[PDB]
Ligand binder design. Sequence first.
Ligand SMILES: NC(=O)c1ccc[n+]([C@@H]2O[C@H](COP(=O)([O-])OP(=O)(O)OC[C@H]3O[C@@H](n4cnc5c(N)ncnc54)[C@H](O)[C@@H]3O)[C@@H](O)[C@H]2O)c1
Ligand SMILES: NC(=O)c1ccc[n+]([C@@H]2O[C@H](COP(=O)([O-])OP(=O)(O)OC[C@H]3O[C@@H](n4cnc5c(N)ncnc54)[C@H](O)[C@@H]3O)[C@@H](O)[C@H]2O)c1
Ligand SMILES: NC(=O)c1ccc[n+]([C@@H]2O[C@H](COP(=O)([O-])OP(=O)(O)OC[C@H]3O[C@@H](n4cnc5c(N)ncnc54)[C@H](O)[C@@H]3O)[C@@H](O)[C@H]2O)c1
Ligand code: NA
Ligand code: NA
Ligand code: NA
Lengths: 516, 516, 516
Amino acid sequence: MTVEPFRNEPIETFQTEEARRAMREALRRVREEFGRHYPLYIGGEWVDTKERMVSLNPSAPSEVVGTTAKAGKAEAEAALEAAWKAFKTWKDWPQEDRSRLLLKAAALMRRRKRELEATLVYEVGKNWVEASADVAEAIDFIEYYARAALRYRYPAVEVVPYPGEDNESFYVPLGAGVVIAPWNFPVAIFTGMIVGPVAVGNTVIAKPAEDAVVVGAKVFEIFHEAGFPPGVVNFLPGVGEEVGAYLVEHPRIRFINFTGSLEVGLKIYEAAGRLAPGQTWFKRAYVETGGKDAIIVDETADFDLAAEGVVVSAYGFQGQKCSAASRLILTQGAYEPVLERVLKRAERLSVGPAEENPDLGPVVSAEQERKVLSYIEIGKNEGQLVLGGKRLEGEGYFIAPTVFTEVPPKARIAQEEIFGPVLSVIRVKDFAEALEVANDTPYGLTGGVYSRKREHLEWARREFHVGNLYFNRKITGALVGVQPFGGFKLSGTNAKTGALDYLRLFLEMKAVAERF
Amino acid sequence: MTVEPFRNEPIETFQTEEARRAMREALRRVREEFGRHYPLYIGGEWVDTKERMVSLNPSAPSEVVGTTAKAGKAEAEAALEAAWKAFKTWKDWPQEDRSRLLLKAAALMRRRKRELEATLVYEVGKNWVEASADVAEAIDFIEYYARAALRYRYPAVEVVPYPGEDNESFYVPLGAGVVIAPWNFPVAIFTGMIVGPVAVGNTVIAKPAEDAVVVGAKVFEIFHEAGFPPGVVNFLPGVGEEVGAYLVEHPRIRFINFTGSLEVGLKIYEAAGRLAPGQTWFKRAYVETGGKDAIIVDETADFDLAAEGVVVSAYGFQGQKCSAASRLILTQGAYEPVLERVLKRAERLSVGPAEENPDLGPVVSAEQERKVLSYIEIGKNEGQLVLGGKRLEGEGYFIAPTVFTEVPPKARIAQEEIFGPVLSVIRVKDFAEALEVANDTPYGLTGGVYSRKREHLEWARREFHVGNLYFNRKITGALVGVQPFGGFKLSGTNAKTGALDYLRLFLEMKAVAERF
Amino acid sequence: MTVEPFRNEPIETFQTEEARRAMREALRRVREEFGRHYPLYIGGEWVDTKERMVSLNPSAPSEVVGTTAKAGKAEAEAALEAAWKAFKTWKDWPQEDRSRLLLKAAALMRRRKRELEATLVYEVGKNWVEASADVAEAIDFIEYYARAALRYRYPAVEVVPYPGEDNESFYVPLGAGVVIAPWNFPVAIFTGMIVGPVAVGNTVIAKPAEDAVVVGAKVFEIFHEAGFPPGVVNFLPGVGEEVGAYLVEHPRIRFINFTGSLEVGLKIYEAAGRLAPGQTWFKRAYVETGGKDAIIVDETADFDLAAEGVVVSAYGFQGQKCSAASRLILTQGAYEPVLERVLKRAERLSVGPAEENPDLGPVVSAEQERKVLSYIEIGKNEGQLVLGGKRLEGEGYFIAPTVFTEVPPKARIAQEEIFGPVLSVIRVKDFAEALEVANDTPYGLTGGVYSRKREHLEWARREFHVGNLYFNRKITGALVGVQPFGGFKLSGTNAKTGALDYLRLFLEMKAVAERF
Ligand SMILES: NC(=O)c1ccc[n+]([C@@H]2O[C@H](COP(=O)([O-])OP(=O)(O)OC[C@H]3O[C@@H](n4cnc5c(N)ncnc54)[C@H](O)[C@@H]3O)[C@@H](O)[C@H]2O)c1
Ligand SMILES: NC(=O)c1ccc[n+]([C@@H]2O[C@H](COP(=O)([O-])OP(=O)(O)OC[C@H]3O[C@@H](n4cnc5c(N)ncnc54)[C@H](O)[C@@H]3O)[C@@H](O)[C@H]2O)c1
Ligand SMILES: NC(=O)c1ccc[n+]([C@@H]2O[C@H](COP(=O)([O-])OP(=O)(O)OC[C@H]3O[C@@H](n4cnc5c(N)ncnc54)[C@H](O)[C@@H]3O)[C@@H](O)[C@H]2O)c1
Ligand code: NA
Ligand code: NA
Ligand code: NA
């Protein structure tokens, strides 16, 4: 290795005066720039368009945080041309050179962390720590993938020798692909899905989520300053079902890296399986979708520890996480003790403008507000509302921490991803039934168990069918490198982000033999 | 390791009297066995049906090598139930135990080698050495995967540690899947696609090609004797578009391992991308399809060495290989010298009943014969026929080694996989044009270059876009472990058989963290 | 690895106000609980007895620090049954699961360090830092053995392969054994001797020293909360020659892990060699006994550094350490300079109630006081008393730092382990004679050399025959992992604690071959 061993970027807690001062300064700089317009980034240059995308402040939707260009089919085609032209030479860069480029990007991002964090606060309503964790994760993806990519360098395949011959197998990148990202982790996931494929030689056309186009543009300002060759990375903010679908169905798109809703992921995976007219390969599509994550608590657990972890997992970033605890499964002996503690903690949570660092900011948009409120109405007919369940005052999309109890395992609110601050509590007889209820959903992303009984924990290790399982701690915030992230079943294709295996997904192998 | 390092099973040449004696006895016994009936194998037992599949001797089609039961939807459902029930416990077997079972199966197959080779001679018309290579490859897959699987044993993932926590990532098998195999390597590929997934904990429903159902049943006799638990491996001979498609489209099939034509592979990949009613996961489909493989020869090559390798690559097993040289690209200075040598060697090839151990046996079936002859008629109007191009006398499906020259790069016979003893010779100006022509097809499986010029060889290593490239030697017969096998573009999903990476395709990862 | 690399638990120095405040709080909580009664722990539950054991405060013996149940033959039998019943399934736990259980225990102990330290202060008279070092060492044993155990996981043995066979060798635990511990390191050694064997699959019946039954019970409160299955670890406070001897001589005790006096160790080793009626194995007995440790100082040493290290080594925890410097061997040129400095430092040492953090607390009991005072009387007839040698005022067993000079190498005080604050100074001619005198004792545990001459240090490295040798530093306080601890000759069986080799002592090997 030529760099220090990987370490996770510390997540700022803002406990010091200097950290708070630095954040206030960043917040001011960011809002003073609310009038900025960010063009598309294609072939190494910023290119503007006639139409535009508008980004609002979810804590004050009448306030615009910025606008960006809007990519249509023509811009998608221009991006494709630039990406394939660039691939021709980018694929030949020594891996050491590509990895150093990522390391430079990581250093530049680290120097602009407060700015990016402040942008997350205003654009998608993350409180201070949720924003810092997001940016820190993005830096982690760059640092981790830069190092991981070297593990695949020419010629990396272990083969069996043969007399009188040289047998050499090695990996090569696939080509130009499209990255379609979500709005909930607009810096971290957006960055990771882009730099992983790019690190090993692929080129990318990135389509940020409509609600986070501004922060996505700032990430590209970093890529531009880092010096990625023209066409290696392209920025195409636009409408998902328009430019996103166009690229997904295109015969010249080699792979698709998607993170988002199951509904969209299903369409993308299906489209990826079709041979478009003139297409000359089998497309690879990686789709990480939602989850309906549960935390199980039995009668042997530390109830206070459990209540704390549950509240953090269910309401962090207003529950807008694919890893959020949306189900709380309690065995009979743990039901009362835990529910009472969860209710007491949850009722003390503050909700308000994200910039004031409340426990909960607003949900991301009017559309999300509509969906969450709709599920709350459905919940009133399936379970018992015991806390919250109301829109709070203000133009911002403030929704109160909500709790439904005595919820049937098969209830819609106990099966469908609400993606809001809504927790469904389910009462079960014992641990075995708790596991049965935990597994009985179409998903399998994250899960947790609070218990002191070793046999229950190890039992869950083997049978709680989720890609990321946590014992006696929160089930959100998977750290790059430490906890490969990705689920089972309808939670996705199990493309483990922040892990060595992730990069293999964007490579193909060639075996060359020479008989002397 | 607890066993000797992997070594490839020696391919018998039958040059010694002992080898000839053993082979003659095996052929005689298999011949005396003609007409035997083999049932389906489901849940650990042989199960017969009313309908049947008939397997003819391509060297004398009036002779029935044998018959097998025929699986329909009911049998597919019974196999699904058995496979999923078996998965529940087979997945928990220590890896060391599963690997030992494969090693036992390999030992049993090795002891029945002559019999299996003799069955290939009669059922699919392979001469003696082609049959021996097929069986040897099958043994290699078992031996190799048994060892490779141990590299993924619990807990195999390299992760970054975190203070106060245990972070453990490990692989787990996917579940029950279907294996759909071709008739050209009915022991090797059939065995490989089955034991790879099974080695790491998956269960399989195997669908042999219609023309090779008897040898497929004999492989299952070996699996049964080895002791695989009931339901771990199931044998379902039947019609591809019927029972095969039924399993591919089934909501309860977890993965599909397919090797066959591009036409079928395309349908399978598309179907796999769809969420069948009630399906709870994203299906994984691996499809290794055909190719239109070329051997390039420039003016610096050893023309005699090249001619020999071209004839072997083009006519081995009647050109019925996904790796067969179906295109011969000659630079101007190599054109006359190489073509004349290829023609002289090819015109001396013997063609006759496979049991006689001729250079070429018959093509596999009446329909394959019809298709090949049809392509020959097409070729007569695209290029210049300079050798063969006719069916020979006799009931068997004998086609003479055929050569077309001055063939346009875009001609149908220079683009479409004929899968018969038909070689298309293309004359180009220089090595640069040779590479352009070689890459200009929808495929990318195998390729070869005969040249003494280092710069041309290394140029090809970087730009001859095929998954398996060979220099100054034949382009067929990839050895397990030595040459990871799999292509690019429409030649498949690049699932490299006989390589460590192959098993990862049938596993998913789980990350479990415990905060102490 | 799935956890961070091993690091030694920092030893608290109490230099900060917070640390002192935390200790005072712990001391108060502990003394407020002096009236507590601690039952035996058998088969996962606390079981009381009719008779009891009383623990006194050596700094104020009229004050009881607690009482515990008292195990007799019946309780020993109940413990044996529970331990063997538990072994049947505990031995089958995956090593990863057993190691995680130890890690949990370590985390729980770390959270109760001040409480345990305060208990050591009041129960066995350790000053603040001696108590913190003891607890830190215990945590270290758990953390170290948890990691070390994984190095022996199935199948760990390196063997030579053989054609046509799978040859697999692996380790398995021995069964149920007894741990008999000393009172001087009642948390550290008690913990280490228990968790090492348990980590790899054995079950244990632990017999704490009579003078430290209370702190031993608290360690078991930690094991109980951690969740060790019923019967895996059992707590049997009681009389050594009663319940201890009973278990040692029992035909159903598989191994004995003992740390204590040579007198007892000799009896245990002899008894272990006998086949008790009905016994079906050869018992393994590990006995780490005393020492008569010397520090050599030559004329080239840093006399002030040497005097400091000598005082620390001889009087730390009142010299009640198997590693304590009880002999000071000085070459002619170093005699005066070093002795004068040692006397000046030693006369400034405070002695009093342990809770006030004096340099020396009291010896552990009336019996130890009697022994130490008796050796002081013997010393007056063998050497010259130059410092201390008196019982100090107060009911506590306070003995003053003592120094005897011009002591004959063969004198009883220069040969027998006093286990008190008594240093014997021996004058020798040169370094060679210093080594001869150092080696001429029945022991061989710890030793030290203060010298700047490389040739003398390296000479000692090769010929100063002790298991743990230290140059230019104290000879006590061996750290887990850094300095494998254990001696030669009558200092024991050389079972190196805090080292990879320790766990091998509690395993046996099986070799299984399968001919395919
Ligand atoms: N599994 C994970 O790792 C993970 C992590 C973060 C978010 N998520 C999921 O993301 C969802 C929230 O994100 P969202 O609301 O942005 O998701 P979404 O599916 O509505 O949109 C995701 C992205 O796809 C685009 N898009 C929309 N329709 C499209 C179409 N037909 N074709 C192509 N692109 C299209 C959008 O513009 C956006 O860029 C939740 O379901 C959550 O569980 C998953
Ligand atoms: N890439 C490789 O490794 C590789 C190796 C060997 C053969 N092949 C290819 O295989 C082909 C020759 O094999 P073949 O003639 O048996 O191929 P094929 O595609 O016609 O049939 C392959 C298998 O699929 C079944 N099948 C047919 N239609 C199906 C459907 N709709 N759904 C599901 N299963 C269906 C058949 O019964 C048989 O078991 C050639 O194109 C050759 O290049 C590829
Ligand atoms: N070598 C080492 O690692 C090491 C470390 C610490 C202490 N020690 C030694 O320990 C001694 C001080 O400890 P102690 O006074 O508790 O020792 P001890 O030998 O008097 O007693 C040790 C333990 O054995 C039990 N015991 C006593 N007689 C027994 C018998 N006949 N059969 C079975 N068990 C019996 C006691 O109850 C106690 O649990 C010193 O000699 C010291 O050198 C050795
Ligand atoms: Na916004
Ligand atoms: Na046939
Ligand atoms: Na005491």
